[PDB]
PDB file of all heavy atoms in Angstrom:
ATOM      1  N   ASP A  56      14.723  16.820   5.496  1.00 41.12           N
ATOM      2  CA  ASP A  56      16.171  16.791   5.324  1.00 41.12           C
ATOM      3  C   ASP A  56      16.621  15.411   4.856  1.00 41.12           C
ATOM      4  O   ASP A  56      16.731  14.482   5.657  1.00 41.12           O
ATOM      5  CB  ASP A  56      16.878  17.159   6.630  1.00 41.12           C
ATOM      6  CG  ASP A  56      18.320  17.586   6.413  1.00 41.12           C
ATOM      7  OD1 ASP A  56      18.870  17.311   5.324  1.00 41.12           O
ATOM      8  OD2 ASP A  56      18.907  18.195   7.333  1.00 41.12           O
ATOM      9  N   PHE A  57      16.865  15.280   3.555  1.00 42.85           N
ATOM     10  CA  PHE A  57      17.266  14.003   2.973  1.00 42.85           C
ATOM     11  C   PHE A  57      18.665  13.575   3.421  1.00 42.85           C
ATOM     12  O   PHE A  57      19.055  12.421   3.245  1.00 42.85           O
ATOM     13  CB  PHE A  57      17.199  14.062   1.441  1.00 42.85           C
ATOM     14  CG  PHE A  57      15.793  14.053   0.883  1.00 42.85           C
ATOM     15  CD1 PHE A  57      14.695  14.316   1.691  1.00 42.85           C
ATOM     16  CD2 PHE A  57      15.575  13.778  -0.459  1.00 42.85           C
ATOM     17  CE1 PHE A  57      13.410  14.312   1.173  1.00 42.85           C
ATOM     18  CE2 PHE A  57      14.292  13.769  -0.985  1.00 42.85           C
ATOM     19  CZ  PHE A  57      13.209  14.036  -0.166  1.00 42.85           C
ATOM     20  N   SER A  58      19.413  14.506   4.006  1.00 39.94           N
ATOM     21  CA  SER A  58      20.770  14.226   4.465  1.00 39.94           C
ATOM     22  C   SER A  58      20.771  13.455   5.780  1.00 39.94           C
ATOM     23  O   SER A  58      21.682  12.674   6.053  1.00 39.94           O
ATOM     24  CB  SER A  58      21.556  15.531   4.626  1.00 39.94           C
ATOM     25  OG  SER A  58      22.608  15.388   5.563  1.00 39.94           O
ATOM     26  N   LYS A  59      19.738  13.667   6.586  1.00 40.84           N
ATOM     27  CA  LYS A  59      19.634  13.009   7.883  1.00 40.84           C
ATOM     28  C   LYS A  59      18.414  12.096   7.931  1.00 40.84           C
ATOM     29  O   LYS A  59      17.471  12.259   7.154  1.00 40.84           O
ATOM     30  CB  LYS A  59      19.579  14.048   9.007  1.00 40.84           C
ATOM     31  CG  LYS A  59      20.555  15.204   8.820  1.00 40.84           C
ATOM     32  CD  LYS A  59      20.633  16.091  10.057  1.00 40.84           C
ATOM     33  CE  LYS A  59      21.398  15.405  11.180  1.00 40.84           C
ATOM     34  NZ  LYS A  59      21.632  16.310  12.339  1.00 40.84           N
ATOM     35  N   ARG A  60      18.443  11.131   8.842  1.00 40.08           N
ATOM     36  CA  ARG A  60      17.340  10.192   8.999  1.00 40.08           C
ATOM     37  C   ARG A  60      16.064  10.890   9.480  1.00 40.08           C
ATOM     38  O   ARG A  60      16.129  12.020   9.964  1.00 40.08           O
ATOM     39  CB  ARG A  60      17.754   9.064   9.945  1.00 40.08           C
ATOM     40  CG  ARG A  60      18.238   9.505  11.314  1.00 40.08           C
ATOM     41  CD  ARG A  60      18.671   8.286  12.107  1.00 40.08           C
ATOM     42  NE  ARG A  60      19.657   7.506  11.363  1.00 40.08           N
ATOM     43  CZ  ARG A  60      19.952   6.235  11.609  1.00 40.08           C
ATOM     44  NH1 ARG A  60      19.331   5.582  12.581  1.00 40.08           N
ATOM     45  NH2 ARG A  60      20.866   5.614  10.877  1.00 40.08           N
ATOM     46  N   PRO A  61      14.900  10.223   9.335  1.00 39.76           N
ATOM     47  CA  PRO A  61      13.625  10.785   9.798  1.00 39.76           C
ATOM     48  C   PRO A  61      13.673  11.286  11.238  1.00 39.76           C
ATOM     49  O   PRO A  61      14.061  10.545  12.141  1.00 39.76           O
ATOM     50  CB  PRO A  61      12.673   9.595   9.687  1.00 39.76           C
ATOM     51  CG  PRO A  61      13.189   8.841   8.511  1.00 39.76           C
ATOM     52  CD  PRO A  61      14.691   8.980   8.564  1.00 39.76           C
ATOM     53  N   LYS A  62      13.281  12.541  11.435  1.00 38.71           N
ATOM     54  CA  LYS A  62      13.338  13.172  12.750  1.00 38.71           C
ATOM     55  C   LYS A  62      12.003  13.061  13.484  1.00 38.71           C
ATOM     56  O   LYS A  62      11.000  13.638  13.058  1.00 38.71           O
ATOM     57  CB  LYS A  62      13.760  14.640  12.612  1.00 38.71           C
ATOM     58  CG  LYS A  62      13.947  15.366  13.939  1.00 38.71           C
ATOM     59  CD  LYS A  62      14.732  16.667  13.779  1.00 38.71           C
ATOM     60  CE  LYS A  62      16.184  16.418  13.386  1.00 38.71           C
ATOM     61  NZ  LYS A  62      16.385  16.358  11.910  1.00 38.71           N
ATOM     62  N   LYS A  63      12.001  12.319  14.590  1.00 36.33           N
ATOM     63  CA  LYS A  63      10.788  12.120  15.382  1.00 36.33           C
ATOM     64  C   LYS A  63      10.315  13.419  16.028  1.00 36.33           C
ATOM     65  O   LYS A  63      11.077  14.094  16.720  1.00 36.33           O
ATOM     66  CB  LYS A  63      11.010  11.049  16.457  1.00 36.33           C
ATOM     67  CG  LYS A  63       9.946  11.061  17.549  1.00 36.33           C
ATOM     68  CD  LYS A  63       9.490   9.667  17.950  1.00 36.33           C
ATOM     69  CE  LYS A  63      10.529   8.940  18.778  1.00 36.33           C
ATOM     70  NZ  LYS A  63       9.899   7.910  19.656  1.00 36.33           N
ATOM     71  N   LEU A  64       9.050  13.760  15.799  1.00 39.38           N
ATOM     72  CA  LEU A  64       8.498  15.021  16.276  1.00 39.38           C
ATOM     73  C   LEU A  64       7.539  14.816  17.440  1.00 39.38           C
ATOM     74  O   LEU A  64       7.667  15.457  18.483  1.00 39.38           O
ATOM     75  CB  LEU A  64       7.757  15.730  15.141  1.00 39.38           C
ATOM     76  CG  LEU A  64       8.556  16.010  13.868  1.00 39.38           C
ATOM     77  CD1 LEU A  64       7.689  16.698  12.823  1.00 39.38           C
ATOM     78  CD2 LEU A  64       9.784  16.845  14.187  1.00 39.38           C
ATOM     79  N   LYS A  65       6.580  13.915  17.257  1.00 38.77           N
ATOM     80  CA  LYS A  65       5.501  13.744  18.219  1.00 38.77           C
ATOM     81  C   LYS A  65       4.921  12.346  18.091  1.00 38.77           C
ATOM     82  O   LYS A  65       4.972  11.742  17.021  1.00 38.77           O
ATOM     83  CB  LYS A  65       4.405  14.782  17.966  1.00 38.77           C
ATOM     84  CG  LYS A  65       3.894  15.481  19.214  1.00 38.77           C
ATOM     85  CD  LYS A  65       2.963  16.630  18.851  1.00 38.77           C
ATOM     86  CE  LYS A  65       2.659  17.499  20.062  1.00 38.77           C
ATOM     87  NZ  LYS A  65       1.930  16.745  21.116  1.00 38.77           N
ATOM     88  N   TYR A  66       4.369  11.828  19.182  1.00 39.45           N
ATOM     89  CA  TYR A  66       3.704  10.533  19.136  1.00 39.45           C
ATOM     90  C   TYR A  66       2.443  10.529  19.987  1.00 39.45           C
ATOM     91  O   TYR A  66       2.279  11.353  20.883  1.00 39.45           O
ATOM     92  CB  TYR A  66       4.656   9.411  19.568  1.00 39.45           C
ATOM     93  CG  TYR A  66       4.926   9.357  21.055  1.00 39.45           C
ATOM     94  CD1 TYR A  66       4.177   8.538  21.891  1.00 39.45           C
ATOM     95  CD2 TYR A  66       5.943  10.110  21.622  1.00 39.45           C
ATOM     96  CE1 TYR A  66       4.425   8.482  23.249  1.00 39.45           C
ATOM     97  CE2 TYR A  66       6.199  10.061  22.978  1.00 39.45           C
ATOM     98  CZ  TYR A  66       5.437   9.245  23.789  1.00 39.45           C
ATOM     99  OH  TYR A  66       5.689   9.194  25.140  1.00 39.45           O
ATOM    100  N   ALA A  67       1.560   9.582  19.696  1.00 39.25           N
ATOM    101  CA  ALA A  67       0.352   9.382  20.473  1.00 39.25           C
ATOM    102  C   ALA A  67       0.150   7.886  20.607  1.00 39.25           C
ATOM    103  O   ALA A  67       0.152   7.165  19.612  1.00 39.25           O
ATOM    104  CB  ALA A  67      -0.838  10.021  19.777  1.00 39.25           C
ATOM    105  N   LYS A  68      -0.025   7.414  21.835  1.00 37.70           N
ATOM    106  CA  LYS A  68      -0.206   5.990  22.053  1.00 37.70           C
ATOM    107  C   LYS A  68      -1.599   5.726  22.598  1.00 37.70           C
ATOM    108  O   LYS A  68      -2.103   6.466  23.447  1.00 37.70           O
ATOM    109  CB  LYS A  68       0.856   5.449  23.015  1.00 37.70           C
ATOM    110  CG  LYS A  68       0.927   3.927  23.068  1.00 37.70           C
ATOM    111  CD  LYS A  68       2.295   3.441  23.542  1.00 37.70           C
ATOM    112  CE  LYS A  68       2.316   1.929  23.715  1.00 37.70           C
ATOM    113  NZ  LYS A  68       3.703   1.385  23.751  1.00 37.70           N
ATOM    114  N   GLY A  69      -2.220   4.666  22.096  1.00 35.38           N
ATOM    115  CA  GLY A  69      -3.551   4.287  22.525  1.00 35.38           C
ATOM    116  C   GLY A  69      -3.409   3.158  23.521  1.00 35.38           C
ATOM    117  O   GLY A  69      -2.294   2.843  23.937  1.00 35.38           O
ATOM    118  N   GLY A  70      -4.521   2.546  23.906  1.00 34.16           N
ATOM    119  CA  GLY A  70      -4.461   1.445  24.848  1.00 34.16           C
ATOM    120  C   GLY A  70      -5.782   1.048  25.479  1.00 34.16           C
ATOM    121  O   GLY A  70      -6.839   1.577  25.134  1.00 34.16           O
TER     122      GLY A  70
END
Side-chain angles (χ1 to χ4, degrees):
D56 199 344
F57 287 16
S58 155
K59 318 189 73 173
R60 56 183 54 199
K62 184 164 292 89
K63 164 138 74 154
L64 304 179
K65 226 172 191 297
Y66 74 94
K68 192 156 175 162

